[PDB]
Design a protein around this nucleic acid. Sequence first.
DNA 1: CGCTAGTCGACA
DNA 2: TCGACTAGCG
Length: 345
Amino acid sequence: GIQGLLQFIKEASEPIHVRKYKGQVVAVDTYCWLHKGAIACAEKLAKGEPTDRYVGFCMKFVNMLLSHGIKPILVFDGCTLPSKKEVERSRRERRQANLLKGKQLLREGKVSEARECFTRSINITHAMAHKVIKAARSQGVDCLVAPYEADAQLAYLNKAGIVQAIITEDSDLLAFGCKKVILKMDQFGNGLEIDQARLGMCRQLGDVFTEEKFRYMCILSGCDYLSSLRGIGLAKACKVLRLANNPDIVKVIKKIGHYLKMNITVPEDYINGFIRANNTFLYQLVFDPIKRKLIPLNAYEDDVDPETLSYAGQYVDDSIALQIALGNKDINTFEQIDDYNPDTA
DNA sequence: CGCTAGTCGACA
DNA sequence: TCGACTAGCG
Ligand SMILES: [Ba+2]
Ligand SMILES: [Ba+2]
Ligand SMILES: [Ba+2]
Ligand SMILES: [Ba+2]
């Protein structure tokens, strides 16, 4: 996500309880709970031992939400965006490297620091997620697998009014333009809410409380799609945008050295990357639960060629998208693994 | 000041 | 995988 984003914007946060959303619909970044629940069984997962502790963990928050008369929508990650296909396979190996230290330290007498490495060799698989889905469906709780990043899917549900808020631990959800976010929510419903309208109560931001500018700042500060120019963080990135009153972000970026009173030359690999990163936050493919069709997160503008946005995600027959979204089609093999039909229940 | 990239803790 | 917390470097 965005390094230190929450701390930068903490002026816009607010302690709340989920009861607040009684009678309403809330989308969940279920992965966050999955990872946390995976912690309790990192050891067992590695040895291939049969563990389901992360399922019960996810259900604890789910049943907490239901007990307060809340309608949860569990959203899950899907395929890996092109353009991060590489940056991700990269983790594949480092996540396997840390799984090596555990095994040696466990056979030395140290079982205390060996375990610290297993938490970092934790691999949240699709099969693990599918288990959680079966549990949720069994309590009548709706589940939705995003075509690509749950971030965009979650953002879409919120902007479309399907859900009134999003429960997540992820910072760069705001960058996708979602209105209400609930961070740090615990088992009992005590969370820390961030409303997009309260961005204006951040002095540090100043004039960059608009969604477009807020997004430019986040990217300049350094996102997943594009690392920032080294020496640029939230404050500097904010400063540039908060200073240059020019609707032409392209020309603005090429003057970064001028605004910061620094001396940086704006490479070519970055100006293009910013355009792509931006197109990824705007137009990443999501699934419209209502019509049942694959769509971009935002309607295309008049200055965007859709045929060039393969890096934000590739389309598929809406039927294929439906089976993936329902959690029937395996992500990697595109091989059906379940026979679930939302219409018949 | 603020960045950065560094480590370190998350659960129980 | 993330975010939080710090040590030093503009
Ligand atoms: Ba993310
Ligand atoms: Ba996420
Ligand atoms: Ba950075
Ligand atoms: Ba301005």
